[PDB]
Design an enzyme around this catalytic site. Structure first.
Site, PDB file in Angstrom:
ATOM      1  N   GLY D  58     -30.644  38.735   7.227  1.00 24.07           N
ATOM      2  CA  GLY D  58     -31.962  39.201   6.846  1.00 24.07           C
ATOM      3  C   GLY D  58     -32.475  40.250   7.817  1.00 24.07           C
ATOM      4  N   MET D  88     -28.069  36.390  11.185  1.00 26.50           N
ATOM      5  CA  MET D  88     -29.378  35.998  11.689  1.00 26.50           C
ATOM      6  C   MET D  88     -29.604  34.506  11.592  1.00 26.50           C
ATOM      7  SD  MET D  88     -31.664  37.445  13.433  1.00 26.50           S
ATOM      8  CE  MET D  88     -31.267  39.164  13.213  1.00 26.50           C
TER       9      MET D  88
END
Lengths: 180, 180, 180, 180, 180, 180, 180, 180, 180, 180, 180
Positions: D58, D88
């Site tokens: 993301g 992430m």
């Protein structure tokens, strides 16, 4: 487009020094009329050229390229208006050889102020909105010494669209005769 | 949006006077935040409200409705910054209750110039370019009273972008304390 | 929209006689505001109603349905301006009870002449270009008796775009007090 | 998404302090997880919270809000990897409490360097290209403190794409046990 | 395009050694002007060539192929601006010989800094942002010696768009005389 | 389009002084019929020219160019309606000389009002709805002296649509003789 | 659309016998208004119903359903025009009980002849072009009975567009009073 | 979906411990089935759960989440196949408890080798081609230890699409019984 | 859809045995009307049901479902007409009980042939064209014993289109009364 | 399209007197067959012209130009149907000189009713539906005298479609010899 | 297409009487092959012509023009299949003079039913389905009297697609000699 014996129809009446203009002035029409004026002026530079106008406008920078080329060459250019000359045809119709600007008995002429646009930061709008106000007040000074009016009359006539006819563009000063 | 017993997760925090802002500021996010500030100030006008900011900008006229309503009401607003506050979250983060303006240890702040556009008819590009020049010099006259710098420094820093961190925004004057 | 205990956020506000307006005026917003004014009037017809304006404009027949429906009910309407009231919010902002038209210290007001279009034969343009000329002089006469200026000042005052401020709409007449 | 008696299936697990993350991270998911971590820590702040990760990456600046908030609050967060934690989710999986970081026996973990873009003049690809180089020299300093490796190893093997398993992430230092 | 008898007008002017340029510069225009310069050079190596410019311009690698070929062949090139000479057209002016760079009386001229873009990883942005800064400081080091100004004064006003005219581009150094 | 031997069959007929019109008039057909009329008038200015009409309409300003050039040149034009002459072929069909307007026995003729449109402010509609009335009231002042009717019959026959020919166009006055 | 304590804002007015109309009349707005009239009539059939009209038009067949149903039921309907009633609101406004049919002093009323279309063989246009000629000689036989005018005036006014006002539809006969 | 008295049609089946799976497996279906298996095993961890499969495959990392959670919790999962279990339903059908797997008499089953793609330069296809060959060889070993075949039989059966049956995927292992 | 105290406006009418049909008959409208006909016939199998029709057209097979269920159930159905009943609505209007078919005095009724299409080989056109000729020789064999006419009249006037009336469909036999 | 030596294949046939027609008659084909008929007539006006027809055409106003010109010119015209002649191709096949209309043994002539459309007000469909009924009754009167049938037979033969077969088109009267 | 000295490559193989067919037989292809056959026949009507076929087949009516013209003219036509002939490629391959139908040894032939469609009412489907059933039994008779088989063999061989070879179409009777 027909064929005349091998020419075509627009290149047959260039042998008689006639230039036709019948579309909007983008950057390709102004590259061709400049070339035709340069060719005609550099093979017999004491004759006279004609120019028939039917344009519904165009660009500002590609309309100030035919103008000073008309002023630069040695022959004299006389402009005739068929149909309608609007907003950059009205700037080339009133820009050749005082004494020789004609019009046909039911034509039209329109004059107004330039258009444009700007987008970006708060500095790139101040850069681009200061150019168009310097560009308006340099066409207002050419039209005032071409037609003959004061400056503060053309500063307020050309604020919105101002249509005229063949009989009241002669009182203003844009043309000189009406052909019959 | 989980249900908390009925509520959802955002209206359960509003019972403890916490407003959450987490998207760009268009014209109907400002309506909801103005309504929530009015309701919380009306039911108990002596407590304290919080406001968490994580927002990549927005419009200017719908970001002057907030910063007006939170100076008009009677309670005191304390602004915290998670994530990133950029170009209109940096104007609301530095605009509530000098003494209480926090930030988390690796957040990020950004400040720059306004944006806009204009189109057509060179008399009404001047109208739209004379307005954004008056709108810029009233934002970097509020930032000088909010942070503490002179005006000639903020007229020079806010140009083309300015990315800071949690430890340079504290020296500049935008926040007051880094939370741990 | 939070769900304050069941309700939502701007229907707990309607219990305290507050109407919010935060979008452009088509004929679905006008229906809802007309219904809310009728419901609040036929419940207790001696108590004052407020109205907060943040709109950028809208239709011209669906904005003159909210105007004459709040001169018709019995309570008094007080109009406040957050953000920007432009070109049909400026016409409803100067329509509250005289003495009760407020504004926040950095807001904006804008006024200009109406818009429209026409298409068809040479008779269906003459039909539709007289309605928009009657609809302009019908609407320059309400603003002259609402603000207090002569008619020939507002006739030449609007004409392009007229952006103002909170301290500059007091002198003209649109605002009675600046809130602090 | 069934109903459990009125509740949900994700809002029933939150009664036992379990947060579930199962999609890509933007600033609309980070808002909800920040709100849930704020709600659970004002409701007996000693009991520990779990967090199950199945996220394929993301945003960089909206995955730092969750990372700051789960060290700001008082309880202890325990992260469990299910499926795949990539680029992430591998940064939030290695940010639970040292002692409690779990993975199921056939899972994956992927690490690499950030992405971005830039567009404009020659002096706006210099503002936005020395920010993304200042942004990846601060994630390596967090990963070197969290896992335990030196800095010149982590800045050397997170250069193209580094895929691991449940048994190589344990030797590297990202997790602590393997659940059976 | 007419058919002057058998060839058109652009090929009739070429036997008088006149080259026209009237569009933006991609690598199809630059492949044709290079061929015309080579053909005119290897036919009579001691006789002057003209070149008319009306161009918004723009491609840096395909605009430095005409420049190098202009300085490589043996005859001397004389550049004339006619309607407009933007970014890489004003750089093709100030490359005609030394005493033969003309302009018509209206003839706007613009100069500014390069444009570009980059996208990818954090290592493929540094490669593409370290190149455009090496390109800019080699363009405005050629412009400082073809004109006569110091380097510190042309790396300062070519920061945003800088429009000139036909009378204040002669004071700068891009023009030698204007034509009547 | 065959190749009668080099020619084709629009240019083999043109050396017998025959002009064909077979499409709508769109400022590019009107630029190509004016040139043929000028060429045939300058070739030998006493012999007469024919013109066959099969058009369904067109624009007004590019239909008053052919009508003007028909009257300006010295030879005499004879117009023949071949399949259908609607709304600007019916205006050009009644402009051959006075006794040389023909029609074949299965033909149609239509006459009606002008068309147009307008968009913008309340002033730019009043500007543009005032030239279409001045343009309508000068076409049926030409038609009323070309056919022979009074003016108040042409003002009410041309209100909606008027399909008639080959035995009613002869009684009205548009043609002179049906060919067999 | 707010909530009144559980109710609505349009369903709260319905228990005071008020029906609102604020959209174009398609085939499933007429269904809802027919259902509301039936429900209000079959509950207490000696009590007045109101109806507020603000609509730009609709279809012919789904506008006769409301006109038949509001005269089949036993109570008496009283129609009020609020912002604009055009071409099928002007037919429903002049269909309440005589003595009712009010209007506010800033309103408008428009009346004109119906529209339609046809497509197909030469004997399927004759079927669908003598149905639309029987519709409009039965609409202005109802309008001439409601307003109280001769038929040759109603079939002469409703020919293009009419555009009356609040003080001009009272003399015609469409309304009875003008409200405060 | 209907309502059972307030419940749903799937919430009632979840109330007596039945999980339904009837669509392709992305990472929203895997989240919901992981949440249901977590909820159902924490309120009574000695009763078995059923699972009905009708899915045509899906993702390959969101199909290992359900497999790991089936092996991880304390109750015993029993998998039944209605319709078709193809290429990832056939991998979860052979992952129920050995002794409790079932299939109805028209229950086609399919197995094949995984899918994927790669894109980039010549050293970013080598990474994505080593990963998928590491991923195939770890599914072959799980199928070999669930069904009971050699590894070199499943290495050559799953090369193209296989398409077994209800009585034909019982000789192969993989279903353990056929229901009524 | 207003709320009536909880209900809505269409399910409050079903408490008084009124079914409302106001859209085209696709395959979801037939399911709903069949369902509520089955529901009303089982609460009390003597009291009669009403059915209001305003539908243009539909499907042939999904309009025979309602026609079959209207004679399968035990109570008696009474059909009323408002607006339309174009194609398959007029086939259900003449299918109520033979003393109880009404119509309001501004209504219309149409009757015509069925429609369809076919595409494929020369055998799959004959298969699909031999079926649409068995449909229309069984529709007008039901219509003949429903209205009362001979068969060779209904085969003759349902050939193109037949719009009638409320007074012209009473002579034909489709309705029984006209309600006032 | 080959090159017969210069010519092409269609203009080598026009060296003899052969005209081909092989596409749908729009307004460009009818402009190019009229020119060929005029050119062949005014070259040697006493021999013959052939015309081969294979076309499903129709543009009724632009299909009577060829029909009028076939009888206006002198020589003679003999039509041969080659592959198919639909409406306005059968009307041209039955318009050659009586005695010289041929067809090959597989030809399939077809005749039917005109088509059209109309949109607008209720008095602009009555104008356009009264023209097509006058246009049909003048084509029936031409077929009734070219073929030889009475009028009331062609008034009901040409009602839907009837494909003939080049041997029952000879009994009707459209052709008068089959070529072998 | 190359050039042979001027010609191209397809018109050089027409001085030797070869016709080349290599695309789908729509119209504009039948119109060219008919013209080439007419031109080659009417200049030397005792020499045979060749025709090479490689086409997937097209329209039915535009493939009967070539078939009729091949037997109308006087020379003998000899057809050669080269790559594939299918469904009006096979119908023209089996139409050359008997004894002169060849095929190369790697060719194949296909024969099947015609195709079509119909869309209107229940009568315009019967009209269009009675034609395609009659266009099939006149193709089966030509194939039966051309190849030599009975009719009831070709009525069931050509029911679905029936591919053949070079050694398998020689036994059937479609060709006379494999060429080799």
């Amino acid at each position: 487009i027909p064929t005349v014996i091998a020419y075509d129809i627009y290149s047959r009446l260039l042998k008689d020094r006639i230039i036709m203009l019948g579309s909007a002035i983008d950057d390709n029409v102004a590259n061709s009329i400049v070339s035709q004026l340069l060719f005609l002026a550099a093979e017999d530079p004491e004759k006279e050229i004609s120019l028939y106008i039917n344009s519904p406008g165009g660009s500002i920078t590609a309309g100030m390229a035919i103008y000073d080329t008309m002023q630069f060459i040695k022959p004299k250019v006389s402009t005739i208006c068929i149909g309608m000359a609007a907003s950059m045809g009205a700037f080339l119709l009133a820009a050749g050889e005082k004494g020789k600007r004609y019009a046909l008995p039911n034509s039209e002429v329109m004059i107004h102020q330039p258009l444009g646009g700007a987008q970006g930061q708060a500095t790139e709008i101040e850069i681009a909105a200061k150019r168009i106000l310097l560009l308006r007040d340099k066409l207002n000074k050419v039209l005032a010494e071409r037609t003959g009016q004061p400056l503060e009359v053309i500063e307020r006539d050309t604020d919105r669209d101002n249509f005229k006819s063949a009989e009241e563009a002669l009182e203003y000063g844009l043309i000189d005769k009406i052909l019959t």
